């Protein structure tokens, strides 16, 4: 996180953004060349959630849902760096390198930028899982072409449908998807796997079968958080060693502002990109006791990659005295810079600004 000493001017913010990109380009999440020979295998499950920010959860009265107190680690100031689904998945799939501009999401990146490819080199079977068919917005195509994720889509046949999207496509029940994930990872002939799971029940336009109005966001979120929390309980009981990372793509923009009305995401505003990220470890000999460890520093995907690197050997799952402080200290910080095509949002001296299509930086409503 480099200096914002100069007074805010459009030129100074342009320069700061350039310096941010240049500093980010030097950042890698470095993986070991091999695992220790006594490594303990485990499953990594990355749950990538559409349309979920702190602001949304507060608007829906779900800040105190039991899910949020169930995590071992929680990032209080994680930035999604974008307000669109495809870009958010690409950024997460490229978690192992510094944050790039929007444009550079659609240019190749170094192979060691690709989190799941880094894990594959260490022996983790890759799984791609979705609670939908990925057709809307060309999402699955972007996951494959720019996120580098070529794995077969995990079988979705016979999954119960809980919502229909705006396009009439199915939204599958997360409980059913996740319970199938348990079986598929058991049957994949590998003791370790890493799964990218994208789920969007909170998407705009989703409606119950037979009902034309889109379903209440709060109701869908309550059910989704109930299901995720109950899955955590099923997972604890399985005895299986699992690291779960819950990473929203971006908020649903429930609460608008003076510049951008509710539901619109053209501008990746702070309220849209400030998303809760949680990590929970299952099957530990010494499970984390007490309330989540809260990481307050500004964070983004690079911190997820570096956290995964820290536990690659799986010893966290068998240690008697886990050094949670060490595990959660010194993770990489990332300034809250967010981009879509031709819109960039930054915090400069703790105030947000927006720059659209190379116009001036405009103070963003606070
Ligand atoms: Mg397996
Ligand atoms: Zn999304």
From Swiss-Prot:
Q: Which UniProt keywords apply?
A: Cell inner membrane, Cell membrane, Cellulose biosynthesis, Membrane, Transmembrane, Transmembrane helix
Per the record, membrane topology reads: Multi-pass membrane protein
Keyword Manganese assigned to the entry: answer is no
Organism annotation: Escherichia coli (strain K12)
Miscellaneous remark of the record: Cellulose production is abolished in E.coli K12 / MG1655 and W3110 due to a premature stop codon in bcsQ.
- Gene name on record? bcsG
Which GO biological process categories is it annotated with?
cellulose biosynthetic process
Superkingdom of the organism of origin: Bacteria
Q: Where does this polypeptide localize?
A: Cell inner membrane
Q: Name one GO cellular component term.
A: plasma membrane
What is this protein's record name? Cellulose biosynthesis protein BcsG
Cystines in this chain: none
Q: Does the keyword Aminoacyl-tRNA synthetase apply?
A: no
Null-mutant phenotype, please? When the bcsEFG operon is disrupted in a cellulose-synthesizing strain (a strain K12 / W3110 derivative called AR3110 with a restored, functional bcsQ gene), cellulose is no longer made.
Mainly resides where? Answer: membrane
């Amino acid at each position: 996180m480099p200096a914002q000493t100069a007074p805010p001017t459009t030129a100074n913010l342009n320069a700061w953004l350039n310096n941010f990109y240049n500093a980010e380009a030097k950042r890698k999440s470095t993986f070991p060349s091999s695992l220790p020979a006594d490594a303990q295998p485990f499953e990594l499950l990355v749950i990538n959630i559409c349309s979920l920010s702190w602001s949304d959860i507060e608007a829906a009265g779900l800040m105190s849902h039991p899910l949020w107190s169930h995590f071992d680690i929680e990032f209080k100031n994680f930035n999604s760096a974008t307000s669109y689904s495809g870009p958010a998945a690409i950024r997460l799939l490229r978690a192992s390198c510094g944050q790039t501009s929007h444009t550079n999401l659609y240019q190749p990146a170094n192979n060691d930028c690709y989190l799941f490819d880094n894990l594959s080199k260490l022996g983790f079977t890759q799984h791609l899982m979705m609670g939908h068919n990925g057709q809307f917005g060309g999402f699955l195509k972007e996951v494959r072409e720019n996120g580098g994720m070529q794995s077969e889509l995990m079988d979705q046949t016979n999954l119960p449908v809980i919502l229909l999207g705006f396009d009439g496509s199915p939204v599958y029940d997360d409980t059913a998807v996740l319970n199938r994930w348990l079986d598929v990872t058991e049957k994949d002939k590998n003791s370790r796997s890493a799964t990218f799971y994208n789920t969007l029940p909170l998407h705009d336009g989703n409606h119950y079968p037979g009902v034309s109005k889109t379903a209440d966001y709060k109701a869908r979120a309550q059910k989704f958080f109930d299901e995720l929390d109950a899955f955590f309980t099923e997972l604890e009981k399985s005895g299986r060693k699992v690291m779960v990372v819950v990473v929203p793509e971006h908020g649903g923009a429930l609460k608008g502002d003076r510049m951008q009305v509710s539901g619109l995401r053209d501008i990746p505003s702070p309220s849209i990109t400030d998303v809760p990220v949680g990590v929970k470890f299952f099957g530990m000999k010494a499970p984390h006791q007490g309330a989540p460890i809260v990481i307050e520093q500004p964070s983004s995907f690079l911190a997820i990659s570096d956290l995964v690197v820290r536990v690659l050997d799986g010893k966290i799952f068998t240690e008697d005295n886990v050094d949670w402080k060490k595990l959660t200290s010194g993770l990489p910080q990332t300034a809250p810079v967010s981009e879509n095509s031709n819109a960039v949002v930054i915090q400069y001296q703790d105030k947000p600004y927006v720059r659209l299509n190379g116009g001036d930086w405009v103070p963003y409503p606070q």
